[PDB]
Amino acid sequence: LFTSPFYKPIVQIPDANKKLKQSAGRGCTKMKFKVSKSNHDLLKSNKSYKLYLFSGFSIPFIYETVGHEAIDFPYPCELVFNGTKLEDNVKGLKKQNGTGNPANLTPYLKVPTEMNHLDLHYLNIDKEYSISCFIVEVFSPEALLGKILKRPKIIKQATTAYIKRTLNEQTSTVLSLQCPISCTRMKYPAKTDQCKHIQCFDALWFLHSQSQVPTWQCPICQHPIKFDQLKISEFVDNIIQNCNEDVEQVEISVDGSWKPI
Ligand SMILES: [Zn+2]
């Protein structure tokens, strides 16, 4: 589904749809389609435009839209576009559904006058799938970080109020300045207002992780979050800007004050 911030649709490619039906065993599904010269000119008009293949669960017996499906490729799958195998990690996190990525067909496209062949080899198919192709504008983690930075941060007053309201449980708590993902000093300590914890994670490393495994779960509380909920924490940010690189942890009291450990 186009709920991802890394790619957004510009136009659907016609005659590039396909339904994959259940198969007991071995099989291969073929798709022929052409990409008009106008769509080639559009791809050339902007460096951020790519041709992405999408696969989703095809829920039967009801109406479904072209994009609303969460990205789910049949696992295992071998995708071959114009003879060249696609090395894309199309379906990451095999254990979870909806954590797949699209396949980039842009570099292996043929001229408009010729035909594009997409083969999909499989050993079995337990559920029906919908296959689509879209031209999309892609965004890198750095641009998305820029978007996050331009947002209003989580004010330090809110964090101090939360600390004071929490530590009255029945002495001190440890705030890490390190990122759980990168294991390095955070540069962009971020989280969500939905998160019930003062600990943060580096926004850039989070976006880097999600760009290859779209779980969209907080690396700390594992709650499902969304891109537009990410905001910088002014409290941890100020603590970092006023600390030496040596410090990895910090002691926090009910006062909101903080001491290097
Ligand atoms: Zn959280």
Residue numbers in the entry: 153 to 322, 330 to 420
Give sentences copied directly from the paper behind this entry.
In budding yeast, single‐stranded DNA is coated by replication protein A (RPA) following DNA end resection, and DNA–RPA complexes are then SUMO‐modified by the E3 ligase Siz2 to promote repair. In budding yeast, the response to genotoxic stress is triggered by the formation of single‐stranded DNA and leads to protein group modification by SUMO in a manner that is dependent on the SUMO E3 ligase Siz2 (Cremona et al, 2012; Psakhye & Jentsch, 2012). The SAP domain of Siz2 binds DNA duplexes and makes a key contribution to this process as highlighted by models and a crystal structure of Siz2 and by assays performed using protein mutants. Our results provide insights on how DNA architecture scaffolds a substrate and E3 ligase to promote SUMO modification in the context of DNA repair.
A fragment of Siz2 encompassing the PINIT and SP‐RING domains is inactive toward RPA. This was unexpected because an equivalent fragment of Siz1 retains activity and specificity toward substrates such as PCNA in vitro. We queried if this fragment of Siz2 differs in any substantive manner from Siz1 relative to its substrate, E2 or SUMO binding surfaces by obtaining a crystal structure of this fragment at a resolution of 2.65 Å. The structure includes two protomers in the asymmetric unit that share high structural similarity (0.7 Å rmsd over 261 Cα atoms). The structure of Siz2 includes the N‐terminal PINIT domain as well as the SP‐RING and SP‐CTD domains for structures of Siz1. The structures of Siz1 and Siz2 can be superposed with an RMSD of 2.2 Å rmsd over 256 Cα atoms. The largest overall deviations arise due to differing orientations of the PINIT domains relative to the SP‐RING domains and to different conformations of the 210‐220 loop within the PINIT domain, so if the PINIT and SP‐RING domains are aligned separately without the 210‐220 loop, they superpose with a 1.5 Å rmsd over 124 Cα atoms–sequence identity of 41% or a 1.0 Å rmsd over 123 Cα atoms–sequence identity of 63%, respectively. The amino acid residues that are important for contacting the E2 and SUMO in Siz1 are generally well conserved between Siz2 and Siz1. The Siz2 structure suggests that its PINIT and SP‐RING domain are correctly folded, with the latter appearing competent for E2 and SUMO binding. These observations, combined with our inability to detect activities for this fragment, underscore a role for dsDNA, the SAP domain, and ssDNA in templating a complex to promote RPA binding and modification.
